[PDB]
Symmetry: C3
Subunit: 228 residues, 3 copies
Amino acid sequence: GTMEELARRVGRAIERYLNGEINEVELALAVGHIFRDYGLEELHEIVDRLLAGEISVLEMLFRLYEAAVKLGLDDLKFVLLKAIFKLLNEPKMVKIVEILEEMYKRAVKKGDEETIKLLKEMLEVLFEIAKAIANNDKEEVKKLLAKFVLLLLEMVKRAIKKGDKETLKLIHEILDIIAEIFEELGDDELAHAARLVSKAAELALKGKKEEAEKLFEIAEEELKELIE
Amino acid sequence: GTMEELARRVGRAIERYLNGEINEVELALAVGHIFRDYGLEELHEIVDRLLAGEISVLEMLFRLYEAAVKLGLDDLKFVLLKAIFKLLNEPKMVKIVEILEEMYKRAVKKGDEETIKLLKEMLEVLFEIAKAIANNDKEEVKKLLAKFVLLLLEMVKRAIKKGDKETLKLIHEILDIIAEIFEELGDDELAHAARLVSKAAELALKGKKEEAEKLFEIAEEELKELIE
Amino acid sequence: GTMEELARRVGRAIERYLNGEINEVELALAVGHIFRDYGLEELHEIVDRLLAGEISVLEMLFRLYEAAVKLGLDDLKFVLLKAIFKLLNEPKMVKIVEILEEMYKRAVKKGDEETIKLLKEMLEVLFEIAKAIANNDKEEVKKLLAKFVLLLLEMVKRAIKKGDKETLKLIHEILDIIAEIFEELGDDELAHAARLVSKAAELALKGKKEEAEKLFEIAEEELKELIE
Ligand SMILES: [Zn+2]
Ligand SMILES: [Zn+2]
Ligand SMILES: [Zn+2]
Ligand SMILES: [Zn+2]
Ligand SMILES: [Zn+2]
Ligand SMILES: [Zn+2]
């Protein structure tokens, strides 16, 4: 069939595994069969490695995400990222990925192609964040989240000069979630920068976009300072 | 292999599922593999739908039966009908299907081809009965059972002019089962018509086939009157 | 992939089944998929017979071993023999198979091709021993073990004329295990012959190979006498 259904099938299999309905061998067999039905041989080999017991579910998910990045499948990428962020107990990251998926789905139905590369760099940053979390190395997580906040700042700067309004709300929600994450990680300056960007986006959405440029430059200067 | 081996394998898998030995994912994987081994692609997609959790076992069985009717596989049809009538708690309908299957196996080893279309029509009627039962609509069940009784009346009329004797006993047993079904459904007139046909068949089998016809047209007018 | 990784994958699947991690349907599906991935169709049909419930795991292992003997896969043969001797509660035979596979692995990395045929004959003898045990027929087990001891005697006679030293230790350990097996089987003469051969091997390894030959012919005539 089409690549959209394939992602739905794989996602349903992974949710069945996560909820406890099926086990690892059943999940491996089902996902390998699904991938083989669509002709994806590399993904089938990666799942075969799980079927042999060499790797675990999280490692298989990481390798599947890398392979899908090489191939260029988007819905499968979002499904795999949500599964990765659900295997690790982080509901906030899953919420961020869900909002980004909604943004991507809104973007693909129109001619906006400049945002797609953004939405993609941010997916790479999210993948690096997940990898760093899996390594239990908390120092790189903050820098990667700072890069994510900078990317969202660039996207909101692009969006303000246009007439979009739902994009502003979604970026505000994402930035609020990241600020909460920063607060839960024992950091205050990066959380303050994220809340500054969120406040600037809120001001721009409200109608007073003249006050937003000073907030934007202050926030970007602070973010650049804190990364180094 | 041959179409007879496939039916036995699928039936065995379904009994393993029904007895509680295997679960739904294992059953889906096994049955899809069996169908793929024999080159039946459409049945494989139908089972794939179950593997994704879109449909249940009963809906999958119904779709498999429809696909096998389109293809023309008989033993698979009988296996699927028995499974359908076993998932719904109706041993009597399973007994009717078993007797029909024995009749079909007896007929195929000889040159009798006229009984084949009648058995196919009765299989269609039984499929509609199962569908109506799944819909919990009790009004159409009685009408469909009346049509089934009329078809058995036609077959017994055909068989009496011939020398068949086991067919007479099997039709008598089937008619008794339908009479019990009608009695358990809170109906008395249709049960009386079914018992009238059974009595006519028994009289013809005994040797007094002169008295059978009066009963025969009496039962047929009663059945025609009760359908409308 | 290569035939070495296939044996590892199959052995891992069977180990998972034996340890209780997976059940018979999961093992059947996994092993059939593994054999299908490498293009081994006959092994796939043999596993299919297990998927349908016609045969059990032990019978499936026996048929797979016979088919691999016909095909000429050695690592798969060792894996299947180990699984067979693990399903039957016999750790000593598993130890014998492990030592034999170590000897085979040592031999295949050099130019020694004469030991390969003798190891093949001993593998046939061990397969016959497993078959006889599965039949609960104890009298043939002793004669087959006598033939195995004679084959080990031939190998030790060949190896003494060469400079091999680890081979002598391995045959000594194997002969000690067979002697323990004979003692546990309520036999003393065959156990005495096995211990005689082991003592001759130990004497030859120590450096006094002049006294080994007398023990050698004594043990071989005793073994020939006891078989008849
Ligand atoms: Zn595979
Ligand atoms: Zn503060
Ligand atoms: Zn499929
Ligand atoms: Zn009455
Ligand atoms: Zn197969
Ligand atoms: Zn003694």
